[PDB]
mmCIF file of C-alpha atoms and ligand atoms in Angstrom:
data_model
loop_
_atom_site.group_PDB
_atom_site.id
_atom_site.type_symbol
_atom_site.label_atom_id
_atom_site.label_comp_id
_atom_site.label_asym_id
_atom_site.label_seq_id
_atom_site.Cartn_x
_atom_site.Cartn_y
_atom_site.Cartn_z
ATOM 1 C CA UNK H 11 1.016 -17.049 12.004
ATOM 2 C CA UNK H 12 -2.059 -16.003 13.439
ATOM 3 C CA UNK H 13 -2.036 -12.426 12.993
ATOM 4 C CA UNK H 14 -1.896 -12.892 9.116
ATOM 5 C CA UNK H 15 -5.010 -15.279 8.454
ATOM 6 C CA UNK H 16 -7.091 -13.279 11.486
ATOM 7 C CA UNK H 17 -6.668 -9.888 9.677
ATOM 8 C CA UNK H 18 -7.166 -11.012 6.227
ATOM 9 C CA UNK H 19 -10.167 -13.161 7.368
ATOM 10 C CA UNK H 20 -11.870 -9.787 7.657
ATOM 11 C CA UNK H 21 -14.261 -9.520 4.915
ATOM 12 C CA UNK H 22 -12.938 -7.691 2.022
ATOM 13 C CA UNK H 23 -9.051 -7.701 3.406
ATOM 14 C CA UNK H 24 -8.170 -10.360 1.137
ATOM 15 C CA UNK H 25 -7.108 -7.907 -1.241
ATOM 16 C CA UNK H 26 -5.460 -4.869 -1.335
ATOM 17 C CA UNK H 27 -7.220 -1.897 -0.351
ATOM 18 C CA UNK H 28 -5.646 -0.016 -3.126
ATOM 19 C CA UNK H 29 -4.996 -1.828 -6.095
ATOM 20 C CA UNK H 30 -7.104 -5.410 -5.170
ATOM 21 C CA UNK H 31 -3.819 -7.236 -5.289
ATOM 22 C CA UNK H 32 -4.689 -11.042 -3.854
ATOM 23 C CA UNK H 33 -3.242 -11.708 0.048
ATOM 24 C CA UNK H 34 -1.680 -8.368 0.926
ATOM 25 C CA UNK H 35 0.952 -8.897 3.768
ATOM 26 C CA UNK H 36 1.442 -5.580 4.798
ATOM 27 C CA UNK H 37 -1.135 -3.026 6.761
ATOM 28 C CA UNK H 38 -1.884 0.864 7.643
ATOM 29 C CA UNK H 39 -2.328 1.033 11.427
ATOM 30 C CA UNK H 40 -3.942 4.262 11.703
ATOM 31 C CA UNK H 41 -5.425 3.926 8.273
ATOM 32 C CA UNK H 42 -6.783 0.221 9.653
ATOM 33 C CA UNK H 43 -6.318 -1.675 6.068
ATOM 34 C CA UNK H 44 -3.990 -4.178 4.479
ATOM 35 C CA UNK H 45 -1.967 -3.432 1.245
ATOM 36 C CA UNK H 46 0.210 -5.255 -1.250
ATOM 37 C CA UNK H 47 3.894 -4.592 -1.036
ATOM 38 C CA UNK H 48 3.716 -2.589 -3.702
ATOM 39 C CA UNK H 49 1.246 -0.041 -2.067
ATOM 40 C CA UNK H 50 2.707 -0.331 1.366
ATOM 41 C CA UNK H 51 5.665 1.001 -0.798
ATOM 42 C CA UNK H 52 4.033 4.009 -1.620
ATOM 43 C CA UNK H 53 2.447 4.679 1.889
ATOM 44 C CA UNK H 54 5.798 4.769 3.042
ATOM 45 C CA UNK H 55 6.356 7.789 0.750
ATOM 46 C CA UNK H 56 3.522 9.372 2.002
ATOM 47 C CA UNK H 57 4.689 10.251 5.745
ATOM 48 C CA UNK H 58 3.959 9.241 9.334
ATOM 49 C CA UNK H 59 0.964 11.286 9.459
ATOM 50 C CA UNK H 60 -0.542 9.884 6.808
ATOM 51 C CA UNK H 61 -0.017 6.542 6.805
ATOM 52 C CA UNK H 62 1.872 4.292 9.555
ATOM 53 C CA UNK H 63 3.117 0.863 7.488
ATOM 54 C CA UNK H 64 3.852 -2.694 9.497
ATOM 55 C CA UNK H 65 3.607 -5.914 8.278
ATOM 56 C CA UNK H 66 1.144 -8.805 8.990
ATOM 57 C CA UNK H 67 3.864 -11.434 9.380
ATOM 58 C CA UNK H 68 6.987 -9.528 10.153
ATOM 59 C CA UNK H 69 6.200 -7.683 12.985
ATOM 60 C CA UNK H 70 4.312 -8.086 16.090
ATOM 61 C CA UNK H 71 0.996 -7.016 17.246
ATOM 62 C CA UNK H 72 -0.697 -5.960 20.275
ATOM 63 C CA UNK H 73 -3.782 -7.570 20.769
ATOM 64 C CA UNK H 74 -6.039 -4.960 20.750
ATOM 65 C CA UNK H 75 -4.406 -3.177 17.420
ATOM 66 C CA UNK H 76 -5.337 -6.674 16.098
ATOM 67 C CA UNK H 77 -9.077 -5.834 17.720
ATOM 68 C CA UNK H 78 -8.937 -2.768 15.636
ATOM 69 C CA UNK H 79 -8.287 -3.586 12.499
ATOM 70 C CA UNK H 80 -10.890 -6.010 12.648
ATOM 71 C CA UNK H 81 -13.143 -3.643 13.225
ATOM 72 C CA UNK H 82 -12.501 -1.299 10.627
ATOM 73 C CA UNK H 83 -11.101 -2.808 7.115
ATOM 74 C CA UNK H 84 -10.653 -2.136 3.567
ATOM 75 C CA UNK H 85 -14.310 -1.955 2.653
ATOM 76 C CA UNK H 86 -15.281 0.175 5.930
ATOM 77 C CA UNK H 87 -12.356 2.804 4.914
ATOM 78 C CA UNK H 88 -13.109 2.607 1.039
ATOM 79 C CA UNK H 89 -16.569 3.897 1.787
ATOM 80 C CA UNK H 90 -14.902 6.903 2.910
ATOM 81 C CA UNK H 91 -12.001 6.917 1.210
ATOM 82 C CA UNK H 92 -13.360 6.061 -2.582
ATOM 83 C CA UNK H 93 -16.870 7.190 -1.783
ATOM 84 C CA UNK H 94 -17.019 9.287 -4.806
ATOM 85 C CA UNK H 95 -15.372 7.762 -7.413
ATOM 86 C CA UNK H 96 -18.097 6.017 -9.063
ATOM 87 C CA UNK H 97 -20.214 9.235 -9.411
ATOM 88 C CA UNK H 98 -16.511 10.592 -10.899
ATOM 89 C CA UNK H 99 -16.332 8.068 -13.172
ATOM 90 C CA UNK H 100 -12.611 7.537 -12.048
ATOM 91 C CA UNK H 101 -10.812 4.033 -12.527
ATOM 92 C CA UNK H 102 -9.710 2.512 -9.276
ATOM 93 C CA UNK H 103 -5.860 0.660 -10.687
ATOM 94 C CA UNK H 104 -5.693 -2.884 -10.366
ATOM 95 C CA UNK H 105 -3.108 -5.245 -9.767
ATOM 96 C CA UNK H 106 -1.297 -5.173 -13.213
ATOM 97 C CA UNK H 107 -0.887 -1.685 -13.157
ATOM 98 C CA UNK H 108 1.994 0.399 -12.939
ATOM 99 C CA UNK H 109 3.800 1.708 -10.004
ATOM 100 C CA UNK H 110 2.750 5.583 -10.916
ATOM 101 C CA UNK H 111 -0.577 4.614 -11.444
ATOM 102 C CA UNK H 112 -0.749 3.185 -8.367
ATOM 103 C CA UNK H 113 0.891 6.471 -6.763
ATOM 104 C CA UNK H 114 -1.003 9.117 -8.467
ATOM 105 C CA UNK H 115 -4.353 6.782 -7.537
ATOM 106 C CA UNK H 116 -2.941 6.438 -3.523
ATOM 107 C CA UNK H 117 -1.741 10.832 -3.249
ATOM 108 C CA UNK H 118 -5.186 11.223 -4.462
ATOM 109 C CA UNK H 119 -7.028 9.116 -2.230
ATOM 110 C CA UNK H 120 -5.367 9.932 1.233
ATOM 111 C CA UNK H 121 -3.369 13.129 0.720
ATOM 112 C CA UNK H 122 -5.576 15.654 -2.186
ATOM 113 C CA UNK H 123 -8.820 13.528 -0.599
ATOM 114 C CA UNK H 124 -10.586 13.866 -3.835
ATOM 115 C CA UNK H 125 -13.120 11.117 -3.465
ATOM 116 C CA UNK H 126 -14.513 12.323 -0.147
ATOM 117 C CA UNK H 127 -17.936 12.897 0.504
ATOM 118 C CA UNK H 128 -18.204 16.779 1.123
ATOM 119 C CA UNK H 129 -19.311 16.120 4.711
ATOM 120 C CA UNK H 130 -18.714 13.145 7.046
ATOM 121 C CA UNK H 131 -21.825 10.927 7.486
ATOM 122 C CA UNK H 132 -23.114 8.893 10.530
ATOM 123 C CA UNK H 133 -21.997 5.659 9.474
ATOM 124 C CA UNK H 134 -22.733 3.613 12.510
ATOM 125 C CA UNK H 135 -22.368 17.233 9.347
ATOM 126 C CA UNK H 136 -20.728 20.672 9.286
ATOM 127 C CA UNK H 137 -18.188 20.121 12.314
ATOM 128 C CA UNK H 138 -15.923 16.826 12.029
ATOM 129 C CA UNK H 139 -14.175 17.362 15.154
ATOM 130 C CA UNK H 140 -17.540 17.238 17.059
ATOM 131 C CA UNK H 141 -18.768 14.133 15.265
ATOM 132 C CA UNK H 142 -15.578 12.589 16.292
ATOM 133 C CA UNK H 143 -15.803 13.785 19.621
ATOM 134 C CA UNK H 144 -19.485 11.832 19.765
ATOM 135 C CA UNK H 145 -18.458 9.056 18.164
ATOM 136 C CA UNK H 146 -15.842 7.777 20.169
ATOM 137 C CA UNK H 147 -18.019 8.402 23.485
ATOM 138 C CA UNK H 148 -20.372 5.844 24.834
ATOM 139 C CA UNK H 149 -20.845 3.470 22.804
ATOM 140 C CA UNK H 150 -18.537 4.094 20.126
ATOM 141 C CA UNK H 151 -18.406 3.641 16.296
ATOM 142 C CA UNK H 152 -14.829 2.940 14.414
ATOM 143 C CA UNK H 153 -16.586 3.805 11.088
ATOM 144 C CA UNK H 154 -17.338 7.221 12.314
ATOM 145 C CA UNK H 155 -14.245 7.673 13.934
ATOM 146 C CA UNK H 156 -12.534 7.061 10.932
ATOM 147 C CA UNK H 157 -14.691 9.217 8.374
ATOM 148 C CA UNK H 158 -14.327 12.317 11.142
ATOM 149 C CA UNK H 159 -10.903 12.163 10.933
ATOM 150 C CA UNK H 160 -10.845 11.800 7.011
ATOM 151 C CA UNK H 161 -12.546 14.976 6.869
ATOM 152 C CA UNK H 162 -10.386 16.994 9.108
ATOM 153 C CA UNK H 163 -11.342 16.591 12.188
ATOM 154 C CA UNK H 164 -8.574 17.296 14.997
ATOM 155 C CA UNK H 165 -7.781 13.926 17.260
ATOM 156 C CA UNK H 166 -7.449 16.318 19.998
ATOM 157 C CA UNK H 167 -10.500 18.501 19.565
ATOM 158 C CA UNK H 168 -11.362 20.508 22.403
ATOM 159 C CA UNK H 169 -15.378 20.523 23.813
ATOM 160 C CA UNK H 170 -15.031 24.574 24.845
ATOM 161 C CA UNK H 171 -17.084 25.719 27.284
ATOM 162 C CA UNK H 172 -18.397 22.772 27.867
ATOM 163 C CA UNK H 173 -15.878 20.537 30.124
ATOM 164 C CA UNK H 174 -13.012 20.934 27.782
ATOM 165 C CA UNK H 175 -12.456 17.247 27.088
ATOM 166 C CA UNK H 176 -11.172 15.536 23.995
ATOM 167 C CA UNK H 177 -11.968 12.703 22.044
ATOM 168 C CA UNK H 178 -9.604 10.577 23.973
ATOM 169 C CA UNK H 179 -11.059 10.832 27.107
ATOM 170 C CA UNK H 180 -14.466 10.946 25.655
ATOM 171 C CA UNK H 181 -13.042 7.496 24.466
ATOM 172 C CA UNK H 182 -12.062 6.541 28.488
ATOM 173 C CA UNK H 183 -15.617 7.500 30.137
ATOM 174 C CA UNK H 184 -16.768 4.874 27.215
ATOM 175 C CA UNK H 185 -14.121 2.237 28.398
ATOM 176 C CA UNK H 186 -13.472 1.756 24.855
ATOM 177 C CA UNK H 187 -9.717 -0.175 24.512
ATOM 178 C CA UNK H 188 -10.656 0.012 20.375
ATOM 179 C CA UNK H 189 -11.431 3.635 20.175
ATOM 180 C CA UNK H 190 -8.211 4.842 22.530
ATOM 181 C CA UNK H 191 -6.413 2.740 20.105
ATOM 182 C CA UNK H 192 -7.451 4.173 17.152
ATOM 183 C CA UNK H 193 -7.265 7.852 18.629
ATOM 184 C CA UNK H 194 -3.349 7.215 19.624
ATOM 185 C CA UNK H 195 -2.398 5.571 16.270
ATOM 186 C CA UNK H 196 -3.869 8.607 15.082
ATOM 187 C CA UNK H 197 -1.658 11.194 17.306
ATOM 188 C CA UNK H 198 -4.127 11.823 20.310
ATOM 189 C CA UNK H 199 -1.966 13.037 22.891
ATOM 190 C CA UNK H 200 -1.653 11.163 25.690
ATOM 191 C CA UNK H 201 -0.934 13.594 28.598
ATOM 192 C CA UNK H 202 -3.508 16.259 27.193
ATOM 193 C CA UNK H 203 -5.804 17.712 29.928
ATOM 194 C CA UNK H 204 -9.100 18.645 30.457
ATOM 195 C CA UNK H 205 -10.112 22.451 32.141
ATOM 196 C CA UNK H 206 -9.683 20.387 35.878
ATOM 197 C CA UNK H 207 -6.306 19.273 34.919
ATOM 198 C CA UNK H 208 -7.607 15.628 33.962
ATOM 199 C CA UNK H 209 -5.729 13.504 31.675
ATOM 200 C CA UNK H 210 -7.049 10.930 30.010
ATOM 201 C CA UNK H 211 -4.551 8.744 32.760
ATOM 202 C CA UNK H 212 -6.538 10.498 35.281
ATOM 203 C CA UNK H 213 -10.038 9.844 33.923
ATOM 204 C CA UNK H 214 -8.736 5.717 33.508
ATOM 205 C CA UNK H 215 -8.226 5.900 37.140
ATOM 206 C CA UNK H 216 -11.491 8.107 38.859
ATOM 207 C CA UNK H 217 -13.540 5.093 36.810
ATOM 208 C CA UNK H 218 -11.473 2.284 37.673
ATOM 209 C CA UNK H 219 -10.599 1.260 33.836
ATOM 210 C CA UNK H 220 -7.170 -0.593 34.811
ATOM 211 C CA UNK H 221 -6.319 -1.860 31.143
ATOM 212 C CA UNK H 222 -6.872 1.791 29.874
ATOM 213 C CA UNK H 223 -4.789 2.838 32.693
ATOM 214 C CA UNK H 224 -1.893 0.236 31.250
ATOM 215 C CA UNK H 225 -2.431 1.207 27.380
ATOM 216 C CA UNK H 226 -1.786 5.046 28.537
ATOM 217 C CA UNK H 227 0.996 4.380 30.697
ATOM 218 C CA UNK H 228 2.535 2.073 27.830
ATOM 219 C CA UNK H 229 2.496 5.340 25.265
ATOM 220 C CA UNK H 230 4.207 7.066 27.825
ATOM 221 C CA UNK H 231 0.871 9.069 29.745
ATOM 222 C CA UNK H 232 3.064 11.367 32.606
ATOM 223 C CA UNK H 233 2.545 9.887 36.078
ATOM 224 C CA UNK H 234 2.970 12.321 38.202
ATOM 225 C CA UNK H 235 0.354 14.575 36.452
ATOM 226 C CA UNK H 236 -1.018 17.150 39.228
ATOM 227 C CA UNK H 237 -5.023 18.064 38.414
ATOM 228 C CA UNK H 238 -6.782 20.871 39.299
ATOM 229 C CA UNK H 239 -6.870 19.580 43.107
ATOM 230 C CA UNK H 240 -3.211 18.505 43.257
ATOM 231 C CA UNK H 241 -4.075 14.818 43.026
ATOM 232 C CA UNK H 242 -1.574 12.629 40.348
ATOM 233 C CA UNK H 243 -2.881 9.546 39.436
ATOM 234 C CA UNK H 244 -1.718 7.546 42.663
ATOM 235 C CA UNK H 245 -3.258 9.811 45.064
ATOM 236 C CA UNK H 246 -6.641 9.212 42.876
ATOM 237 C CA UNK H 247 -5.989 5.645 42.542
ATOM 238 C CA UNK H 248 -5.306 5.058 46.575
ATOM 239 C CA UNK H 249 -8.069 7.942 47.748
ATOM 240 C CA UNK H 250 -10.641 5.121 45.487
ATOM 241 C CA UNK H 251 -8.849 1.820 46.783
ATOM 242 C CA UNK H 252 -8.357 0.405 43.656
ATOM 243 C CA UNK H 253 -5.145 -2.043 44.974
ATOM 244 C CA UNK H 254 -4.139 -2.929 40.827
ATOM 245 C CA UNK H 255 -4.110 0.771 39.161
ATOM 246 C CA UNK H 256 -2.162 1.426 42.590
ATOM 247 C CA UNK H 257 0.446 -1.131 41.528
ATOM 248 C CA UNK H 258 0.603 -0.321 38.432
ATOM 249 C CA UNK H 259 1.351 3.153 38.986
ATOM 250 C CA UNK H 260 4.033 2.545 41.389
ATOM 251 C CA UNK H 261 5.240 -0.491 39.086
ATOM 252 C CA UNK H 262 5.625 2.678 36.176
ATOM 253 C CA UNK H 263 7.607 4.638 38.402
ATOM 254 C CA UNK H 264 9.737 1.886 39.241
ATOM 255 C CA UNK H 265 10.422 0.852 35.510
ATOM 256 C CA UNK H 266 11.210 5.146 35.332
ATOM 257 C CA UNK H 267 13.951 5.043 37.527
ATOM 258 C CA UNK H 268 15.650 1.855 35.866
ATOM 259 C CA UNK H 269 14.940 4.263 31.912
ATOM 260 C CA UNK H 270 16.449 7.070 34.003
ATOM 261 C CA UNK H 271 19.592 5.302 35.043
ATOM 262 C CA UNK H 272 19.453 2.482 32.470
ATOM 263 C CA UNK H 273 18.993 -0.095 31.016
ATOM 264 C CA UNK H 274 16.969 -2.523 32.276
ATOM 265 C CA UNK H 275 13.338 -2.009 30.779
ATOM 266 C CA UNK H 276 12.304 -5.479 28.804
ATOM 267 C CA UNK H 277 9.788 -7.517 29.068
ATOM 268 C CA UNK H 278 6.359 -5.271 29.722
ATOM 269 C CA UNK H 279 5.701 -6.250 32.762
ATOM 270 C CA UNK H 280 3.154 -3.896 33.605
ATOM 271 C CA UNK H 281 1.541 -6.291 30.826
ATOM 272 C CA UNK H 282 1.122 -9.940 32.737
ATOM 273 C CA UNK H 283 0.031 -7.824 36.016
ATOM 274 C CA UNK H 284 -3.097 -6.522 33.674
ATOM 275 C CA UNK H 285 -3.979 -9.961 32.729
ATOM 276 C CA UNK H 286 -3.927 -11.216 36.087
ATOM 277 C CA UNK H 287 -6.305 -8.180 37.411
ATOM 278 C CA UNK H 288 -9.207 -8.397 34.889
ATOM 279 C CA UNK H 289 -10.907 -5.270 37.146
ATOM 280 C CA UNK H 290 -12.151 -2.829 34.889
ATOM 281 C CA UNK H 291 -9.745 -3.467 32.431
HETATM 282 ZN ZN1 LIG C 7 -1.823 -2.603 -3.861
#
């Protein structure tokens, strides 16, 4: 059960990032904290776009959404999320306290946002989709990620006039597995292009990032994607000679016409061929 003891072992996600109950089992992906099952309860309630519930024991994990909530955490997202409450003199529940408590507490906190900051800080500002934008490029910080999107900022924000590029492919140029992560649990779009035509499956390939190239293709990024200069990933890919994104590609395309006619999609596959390539990725 090493999942479980890894995330928990995180400073501060011992408790519940809600109420404080001891040894919470349950987690917010996109949020990045744990929760008691009480709490997990109520984020349920709450909507996919708000909150995205899985357990620490029940389900399984992908290592690098284990990466990421190790990297962001309970006290990390109550700095954002409870950042004013102590000058608002408002009572955080705890453990013992009742299940409308806890929901009136948990609506406030992540859907009204009343104990927000007015603006997003630096933490590793009048625009939050800009400060996102930075903050997942080159070299990238979670915290400020996170406290971005708290404060509005759209996961695919657009850089007008100015290359057109988004936060996820910002994310790509940086080679940053933990920021593209966070941006898709957060509904980046996968396929969305820059003013050349470049999708962030596009960018993965030009630099040669093959386990970026895998995550994308994994949330289903569109193969045959034609850019600006009528190049799809593979013509990129063999125009560079990069032999494993190459494979891969053709490998997706493969697994595509087995979905089309089905079934015979399993056991990912495109997966043990990254391992055995770390290339870029
Ligand atoms: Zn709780």
């Amino acid at each position: 059960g090493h999942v479980v003891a890894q995330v928990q072992s995180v400073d501060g996600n011992a408790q519940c990032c809600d109420c404080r109950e001891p040894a919470p089992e349950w987690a917010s992906i996109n949020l990045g904290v744990t929760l008691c099952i009480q709490c997990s309860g109520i984020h349920r309630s709450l909507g996919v776009h708000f909150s995205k519930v899985r357990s620490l024991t029940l389900d399984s994990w992908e290592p690098e959404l284990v990466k990421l909530m190790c990297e962001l955490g309970n006290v990390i997202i109550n700095q954002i999320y409870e950042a004013r409450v102590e000058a608002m003199a408002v009572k955080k529940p705890g453990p013992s306290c009742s299940r409308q408590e806890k929901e009136a507490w948990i609506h406030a906190k992540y859907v009204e946002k009343k104990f927000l900051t007015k603006l997003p800080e630096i933490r590793g500002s009048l625009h939050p989709g800009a400060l996102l934008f930075r903050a997942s490029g080159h070299p990238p910080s979670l915290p400020t990620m996170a406290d971005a999107l708290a404060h509005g900022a759209d996961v695919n924000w657009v850089n007008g006039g100015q290359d057109n590029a988004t936060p996820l492919i910002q994310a790509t140029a940086a080679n940053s597995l933990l920021a593209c992560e966070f941006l898709l649990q957060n509904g980046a779009n996968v396929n969305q292009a820059d003013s050349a035509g470049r999708g962030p499956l596009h960018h993965a390939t030009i630099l040669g990032h093959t386990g970026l190239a895998c995550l994308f293709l994994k949330r289903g990024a569109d193969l045959g994607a034609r850019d600006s200069e009528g190049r799809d990933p593979l013509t990129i890919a063999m125009e560079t000679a990069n032999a494993d994104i190459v494979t891969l590609l053709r490998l997706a395309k493969m697994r595509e016409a087995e979905a089309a006619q089905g079934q015979a999609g399993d056991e990912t596959y495109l997966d043990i061929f990254r391992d055995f390539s770390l290339a870029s990725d």
